[PDB]
Design a binder for this molecule. Structure first.
Ligand SMILES: Nc1ncnc2c1ncn2[C@@H]1O[C@H](COP(=O)(O)OP(=O)(O)OP(O)(O)=S)[C@@H](O)[C@H]1O
Ligand SMILES: Nc1ncnc2c1ncn2[C@@H]1O[C@H](COP(=O)(O)OP(=O)(O)OP(O)(O)=S)[C@@H](O)[C@H]1O
Ligand SMILES: [Zn+2]
Ligand SMILES: [Zn+2]
Lengths: 207, 207
């Protein structure tokens, strides 16, 4: 259909630690480093979903799934005028390769008395399986946020969202309340570590 | 789309009276005669209906309506597998011209002491408006039967139909009972009587 392109930035001026990750840098390019502990099996991630409407059994395709399962809003046929009822058909959909790496802090980066921090890096596209457990790898990519329901019970005023009930024309319970609790994750577009059994291939690629 | 053709038989060897009409001749060509008393306004009759299925909003056309409103049995798309839920869309349908003539017995055909009999003749196609009240017209066409719910309370064993409940695989109320009471009507394909103000047109068509 269409080739998906992966822009892989690298050679950033600075490399950040896991504990240097802060919420100001959400959705920004940056490089981190860490020791890989666990890697997921590459798994298919819904990239361009196809949807079938229950009223109009047409097929709407190329529904871009940015970061989460998102049904469309308008049907292709003008008569249906439906927005909330759709079915995902998996064969007629498109997928990407997704691996979730877990990275601990390097042994030389852990502060005094503190315990190592862990981060969930998301490898996508051709960067999957480029990191294996034990290796110290540096990742370049986006610092993103993912839903974290475990923040319940934590101290503080956890953010929440409510639908705006003005300009709505009541006649004389429509809550729509969600929990805006997130945790910082990483989406890597480039992995480099910081099968050789053949002699000639080893000598060929060497200065 | 397609021209509808009217075969108009005439010049039958014998002409029947209204009281000579018997149930052996149902669905057979024959000629009657009678004095017209009432004629309907020409009305549109559903001839080739178009149906839209609620599941598959496709359009099935050329659904031949023989003598009564008949929905289809199989959808055009193989996936739907629906048979009982359809909607008739009137613009996308086809119609014929229908007039219902009422004809009494001729004054010379009424028996002794009896009262004149009346019959409802159905003119279709190009034969509409060919009979007007007062004229003694002879009709050629089919002796048909139409539902007659007024036969309730009449003496005798009125026929009825029940669904066959054998070979049905019960597991241990599905009545489907209908009234098979009909009355004899007539469907005329040819009308001849048994605007002239201009002199020349009158003399031209004359022996
Ligand atoms: N039920 C299982 N049977 C066998 N091996 C397993 C099983 N669960 C996990 N593993 C092993 O753990 C490795 C990690 O792959 P996954 O279990 O798919 O990923 P994961 O680290 O659990 O990440 P997520 O969060 O579940 S996507 C697998 O490749 C297997 O080697
Ligand atoms: N409500 C009415 N208003 C005016 N004229 C009427 C009315 N009803 C009947 N007529 C007259 O009666 C004539 C017969 O036409 P229809 O009433 O359509 O047919 P009909 O003889 O009642 O047959 P069916 O059985 O109803 S199809 C019309 O052409 C009018 O002249
Ligand atoms: Zn729709
Ligand atoms: Zn259907």
């Amino acid at each position: 259909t269409e080739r998906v392109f992966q822009i892989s930035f690298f050679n950033l001026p600075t490399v950040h630690r896991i504990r240097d990750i802060r919420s100001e840098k959400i959705g920004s390019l940056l490089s981190i480093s860490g020791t890989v502990t666990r890697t997921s099996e590459v798994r298919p991630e819904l990239y361009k979903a196809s949807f079938t409407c229950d009223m109009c059994r047409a097929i709407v395709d190329n529904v871009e799934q940015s970061f989460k399962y998102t049904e469309p809003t308008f049907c292709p046929n003008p008569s249906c005028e439906n927005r909330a009822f759709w079915t995902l058909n998996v064969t007629r959909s498109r997928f990407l390769d997704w691996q979730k790496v877990r990275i601990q802090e390097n042994a030389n980066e852990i502060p005094t008395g503190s315990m190592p921090r862990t981060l969930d890096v998301i490898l996508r596209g051709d960067s999957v399986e480029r990191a294996k457990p034990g290796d110290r790898c540096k990742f370049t990519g986006v610092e993103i946020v993912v839903p974290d329901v475990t923040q319940l019970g934590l101290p503080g005023v956890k953010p929440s969202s409510t639908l705006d009930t003005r300009g709505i024309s009541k006649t004389t319970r429509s809550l729509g309340v969600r929990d805006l609790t997130y945790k910082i994750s990483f989406l890597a577009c480039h992995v480099i570590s910081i099968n050789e059994r053949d002699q000639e291939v080893f000598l060929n690629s060497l200065s």
